[PDB]
Amino acid sequence: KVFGRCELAAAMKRHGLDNYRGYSLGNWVCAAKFESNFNTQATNRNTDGSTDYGILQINSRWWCNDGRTPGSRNLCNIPCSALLSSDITASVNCAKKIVSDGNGMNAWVAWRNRCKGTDVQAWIRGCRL
Numbered sequence: 001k002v003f004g005r006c007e008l009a010a011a012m013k014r015h016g017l018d019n020y021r022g023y024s025l026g027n028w029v030c031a032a033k034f035e036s037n038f039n040t041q042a043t044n045r046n047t048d049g050s051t052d053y054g055i056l057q058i059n060s061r062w063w064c065n066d067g068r069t070p071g072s073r074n075l076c077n078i079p080c081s082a083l084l085s086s087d088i089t090a091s092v093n094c095a096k097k098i099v100s101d102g103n104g105m106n107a108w109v110a111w112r113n114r115c116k117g118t119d120v121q122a123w124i125r126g127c128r129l
């Protein structure tokens, strides 16, 4: 599924991401835009042999199990394929674990480099929330 911007904002709000650990909704929509272009089916392989999955590009070395990654911890206790669903529940629940694990949203490279410090509430402008 390729989400619309306001459509994704409303889904993330419904699943409890607005201000989760103090990160306003725009931060999450911004991260999704630059990690996956709002596409739940996005995957990208990394040099270390891990793969990133789904709308928030969650990594298989730490968070989900894809059956092919050296030393995976599977901390969200889920197969990585579950993160590609058009239902974002699994991705959101795992993201809440990630953003609580010490480094906040700095775990997402695209957020650090393209969202952090910008006016992120532009990402929810015009949306009926």
Ligand SMILES: CC(=O)N[C@@H]1[C@@H](O)[C@H](O[C@@H]2O[C@H](CO)[C@@H](O[C@@H]3O[C@H](CO)[C@@H](O)[C@H](O)[C@H]3NC(C)=O)[C@H](O)[C@H]2NC(C)=O)[C@@H](CO)O[C@H]1O
Binding pocket: 052, 056, 057, 058, 059, 061, 062, 063, 098, 101, 102, 103, 107, 108
């Ligand atoms: C969205 C996504 O999958 N991002 C990936 C990052 O999670 C990953 O960075 C590493 O994440 C782990 C898991 O949280 C970090 O470990 C934690 O580090 C803090 C201190 O920094 C410590 O207090 C926590 O206890 C510890 N957790 C565990 C379970 O040990 C680790 O620091 C991150 N590593 C770096 C270099 O930032 C990166 C790199 O694998 O990939 C992203 O895709």
